[PDB]
């Protein structure tokens with residue numbers, strides 16, 4: 001089996017509520033004596049089993065644009081995972097607070113980083129199923145990473161199981177078919193989110209109507225600050241049939257290249 005990294009409970013010093021805590025952590029950083037971390041704690045039947053599995057996953061599911069997972073903490077009571085600290089909080093919130101401020105080059109840099117994480121995710125055959133800006137974190141210097149924080153203040157983005165329908169393609173709405181291609185669909189919407197400063201897709205629309213409009217083949221309109229090429233990438237994510245969608249490697253290549261070439 002996968003050996004998850006264990007962190008001594010005594011090496012964590014809680015500081016502040018961020019169900020997640022900002023903490024100092026000792027005996028971790030090669031250099032600095034202590035380093036800031038984010039700490040998540042919970043205790044049920046398929047909580048404890050899910051927790052261990054997730055830790056094993058996150059032990060190797062690691063990449064520059066995935067939230068760094070440091071390991072698990074203590075011996076069980078409570079169950080604690082240790083993640084990197086990203087000072088700027090979740091991207092959704094950050095977008096919204098940097099809205100009518102973020103320029104084109106920055107938005108591309110955000111979008112391209114997320115695509116980069118998704119390229120890694122696809123290479124690992126990992127289907128995320130809940131990709132959206134609310135599930136990204138922002139670090140120093142617009143550093144952006146993908147995590148998976150579950151489905152409270154984004155409760156409206158889910159539909160009574162809980163479904164992030166506004167970020168889902170038709171085949172996921174209908175058959176609950178989730179693949180890299182449905183992740184690609186979501187990415188298209190993240191793209192829309194980014195260029196609208198974290199507005200909710202189909203805000204005017206009830207959940208039922210969203211389900212209707214997605215099934216109908218209707219797509220989000222282009223934001224004012226979105227260059228047509230970027231919207232085109234949006235469309236390639238929103239092809240009705242999944243095998244016709246751009247794959248994440250192409251999307252990243254396009255977004256990366258635009259970002260590099262933009263003042």
Ligand SMILES: O=C(Nc1cccc(Nc2ccc3c(c2)NC(=O)/C3=C\c2ccc[nH]2)c1)Nc1cccc(C(F)(F)F)c1
Nearest residue numbers: 018038040066067083084085086087088089146147148149
């Ligand atoms: O992300 C996951 N778990 C999880 C659950 C709860 C919390 C966290 N990590 C987290 C959450 C919030 C913050 C953080 C780490 N570091 C911070 O700095 C955070 C918030 C903040 C607010 C203001 C400043 N910082 C991970 N699991 C997971 C499972 C499968 C795949 C993935 C992947 F690939 F990363 F998407 C992922």
Ligand SMILES: [Cl-]
Nearest residue numbers: 012013014015
């Ligand atoms: Cl403590």
